[PDB]
Symmetry: C3
Subunit: 113 residues, 3 copies
Amino acid sequence: SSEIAALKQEIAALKKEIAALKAGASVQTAATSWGTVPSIRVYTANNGKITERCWDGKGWYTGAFNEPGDNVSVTSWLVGSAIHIRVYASTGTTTTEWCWDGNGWTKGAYTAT
Amino acid sequence: SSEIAALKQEIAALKKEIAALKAGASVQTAATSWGTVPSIRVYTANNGKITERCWDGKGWYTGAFNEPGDNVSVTSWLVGSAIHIRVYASTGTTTTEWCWDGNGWTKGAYTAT
Amino acid sequence: SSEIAALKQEIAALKKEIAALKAGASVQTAATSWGTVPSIRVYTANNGKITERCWDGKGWYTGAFNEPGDNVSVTSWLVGSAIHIRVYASTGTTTTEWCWDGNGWTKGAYTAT
Ligand SMILES: OC[C@H]1O[C@@H](O)[C@@H](O)[C@@H](O)[C@@H]1O
Ligand SMILES: OC[C@H]1O[C@@H](O)[C@@H](O)[C@@H](O)[C@@H]1O
Ligand SMILES: OC[C@H]1O[C@@H](O)[C@@H](O)[C@@H](O)[C@@H]1O
Ligand SMILES: OC[C@H]1O[C@@H](O)[C@@H](O)[C@@H](O)[C@@H]1O
Ligand SMILES: OC[C@H]1O[C@@H](O)[C@@H](O)[C@@H](O)[C@@H]1O
Ligand SMILES: OC[C@H]1O[C@@H](O)[C@@H](O)[C@@H](O)[C@@H]1O
C-alpha cells in the first residue's frame, strides 16, 4: 500500500540521524601538567562517570579522583612544589567543582550563578 | 494487524535512541587560572551561549565575557601581573577567538585556515 | 487515513529532536600557550579529524599535527625555551596521546587503564 510506504520512508530518513549522533559521541578528556618532570593528570569523562590517570615521570597509574560527569574541564597551579587542582564536572546544567589541595578531593564553592 | 505491527516495532526501536542522546547532551566548560592566589575563570557554553564565572580569592562572581558558542576552549598567560586570555568559541565549524588584554574583550585574528 | 495516522504522529514527535541534536553538534577545540610572546596552538577536532593552528607573534599558520579524533585535550610545558606538548585525541573510548618534544610528533605511552 501507499499509506504503509509513507511511514516506511519516514523510518528510513529518521534512522539516518541515529548513526551521525552515535558517530560523534566519543569520551571527553581534560589534561593539566606542572613542574619540570613533568607531572600530568588526564581526566576522562566516560558514560556520566569521570576518572583520573596520572604520570609522575615513570609510568601511568590511576589517581584517586572518582566523580560523576558527562563533560570535564581542569586547571592546576603550584604554591611552591605543592599542586592545587580544580576539576569542573558537568551533568545536565550542573557544573560541580572538585578541589585537590594536597590530601583529599573536596566539593568546591563554585556556583554557575 | 501485522502491517500495523511492523511500524509499531520500528517506532519502538527508534524512539528509544532519541531520549538517551538528549539525556546525555550536557553543558561544556573551559577553565584557566594564574598567579598564586589564584585567579580562576570558568567559561560555560550552555545552549549556544557562553558565560564567564570569576574567582579572585574571595568568592565567585559573573565576568564580562558574553558571546555565542556551543563549544569553548581557553588559554591565558601573564605579562608581569597583567593577565592575557584567549577564549575559542565554536558554532557549526566556525571557531571564533575572543581576546582579553586588560580592558575589553575583542574578536581575535584567529582563522581556522 | 486513521490507521496510518498513528505513525504520522510518532514521526511528528521524533522529527522533534533531530533538529536540536544537529543544532548543538559543533566542532571541538583545545588551546595551549607558552612564553611571553606568546606562542599559542589551537587543536580543532572536526569530523573525526583533528588539525593544529599556530600563532608565534606574526600571524596564524597550520601546524604539523594531523591525527584522527572526535574530542581533543592539550597541555604543554617548557624545559627552558623548548616547548613540550601532549595532545589527547579521543575516538569512541580510545584516548590516544600524541607527544611533541622539539622535532616530531610520536604516539605516547598513555593507556586509559
Ligand atoms: O599521586 C596521585 C595523586 O596526585 C595528586 O596530585 C592528585 O592528582 C590525586 O588525584 C592523585 O591521586
Ligand atoms: O578551598 C576550596 C576553594 O578553593 C578555591 O581556590 C576555589 O576553587 C573555590 O571554588 C573552592 O571552594
Ligand atoms: O575581574 C573580572 C574580569 O577579569 C578579567 O581578567 C576577565 O576575565 C574579564 O572577563 C572579567 O570580567
Ligand atoms: O591582540 C589580538 C591578537 O592577540 C594574539 O595573541 C593572538 O591571539 C591573535 O589571534 C589576536 O588577534
Ligand atoms: O612551528 C610550528 C610547530 O610548532 C611546534 O611547537 C608544534 O606545535 C608543531 O605542531 C608545529 O608544527
Ligand atoms: O616521551 C614520551 C612520553 O612523555 C611523557 O611525558 C608522557 O606523556 C608519556 O605518556 C610519553 O610516552
